């Protein structure tokens, strides 16, 4: 089979910049190469075929070059809606094979998260479990540290985090962290706190609540 190796695995660049993604085939594919754009949950969109031909509706700031085994996709005047995974596909030979993808991030100016903490609902507590949620909203860059504290004891191993797709207009991220405790443990403690460290914050920021307080 023809193995397609795409580089880099990810890249980050500012609006208006120019970036290049490379695809290398394990043998000569004679410019039988297509490039696609894919966003999370959405279907692939065909950008380029025959290594350099733009498909309908594709802006000309996308351009494909290359020959032999080595091809390049170049995106100029990078736009915020270009956040996506890009992959190549060779059409020379069966089995048709794809590169592993390149994820593209837009670099924007630092933006601090707005932070919100949510206590567990009474309905959930009937289940015997308590989920505490900390939201970090609309921040950049993606790196961020969330620390949970329960009556000033640091919690470790009992939370999970998720991050949204970089926003296609404002280029921010948002993040949710959920701390899970038994109802019994929840009811034995008073102060629940989410502490957030992020480049846009001068010092870490803590949002807290007291169990049972309206």
């Amino acid at each position: 089979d023809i193995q397609m190796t795409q580089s880099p695995s990810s890249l980050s660049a500012s609006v208006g910049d120019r970036v290049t993604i490379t695809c290398r085939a394990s043998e000569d594919i004679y410019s039988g190469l297509a490039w696609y754009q894919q966003k999370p949950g959405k279907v692939p969109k065909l950008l380029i075929y025959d290594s350099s031909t733009l498909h309908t509706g594709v802006p000309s700031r996308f351009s494909g070059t290359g020959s032999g085994t080595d091809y390049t996709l170049t995106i100029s005047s990078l736009q915020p809606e270009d956040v996506a995974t890009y992959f190549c596909q060779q059409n020379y030979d069966f089995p048709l094979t794809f590169g592993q993808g390149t994820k593209l991030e837009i670099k924007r100016t630092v933006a601090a998260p707005s932070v919100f903490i949510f206590p567990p609902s009474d309905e959930q507590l009937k289940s015997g479990t308590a989920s505490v949620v900390c939201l970090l909203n609309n921040f950049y860059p993606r790196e961020a540290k969330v620390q949970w504290k329960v009556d000033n004891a640091l919690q470790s191993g009992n939370s999970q985090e998720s991050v949204t797709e970089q926003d296609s207009k404002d280029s921010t991220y948002s993040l949710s962290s959920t701390l899970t405790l038994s109802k019994a443990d929840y009811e034995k403690h008073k102060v629940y706190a989410c502490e957030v460290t992020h480049q846009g914050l001068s010092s870490p920021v803590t949002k807290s609540f007291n169990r049972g307080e309206c």
Binding site: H55, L96, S131, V133
Partner: protein, 268 residues
Amino acid sequence: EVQLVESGGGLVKPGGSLRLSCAASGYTFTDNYIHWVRQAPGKGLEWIGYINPSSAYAHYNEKFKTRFTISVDKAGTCPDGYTRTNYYCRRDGCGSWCNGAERQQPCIRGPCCCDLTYRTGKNSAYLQMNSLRAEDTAVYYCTRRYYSAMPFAYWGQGTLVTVSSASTKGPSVFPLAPSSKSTSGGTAALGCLVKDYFPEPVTVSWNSGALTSGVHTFPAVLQSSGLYSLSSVVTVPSSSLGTQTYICNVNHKPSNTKVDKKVEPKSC
């Protein structure tokens, strides 16, 4: 419009089988091959095979030949002014012989014999998969080329196939209620916690889709219990919290669980 609409995906236990369907409409069904492609988490896309609906000939990636079968519906229609016979069509008011497959295959202009054809509308291709294992978990697409010698330009929406021994479970939906300390005249946050479901996926909307600005629906996380959880949040004006209604519409089709959850400031 050209549409490929997939269905049939869902949870299957190791060793089991599943048939997916790709309903194609908006173009002459026999004019283009239908391919199947899959995408496992992290891994890149993987081509499975194709079928030519004109001939029902299928060609497979060697990796999948033993376990996967691509097929299409049988055609059973003869054009107007033709009458069906054993396996082909006969033109009304003709009787002479017709030379086997050669003259019972393409329908040349209006011949004495013409092959059976599909009706306009939805016509389907299928992907049958058996002896599934965990590494076959993926989103499965059907897709077709824009034209001969051009790449895949039309894609089915994708259907999720989950190969696992875990049982189906519908989510509980809990409020992330707006804080009583929300800034006067500022911005407040609220949300829905969609907890403990299996398999993926769940969808969330707000106010039946009328509320989209400020919404963030997070990727699910797989908990140590083997169940998924996710959150959906929205920021709104603090001043709207007494008046405007906020309902998250959760749908976990794998368990037939639809929930509308009103989210409001907690009373004391």
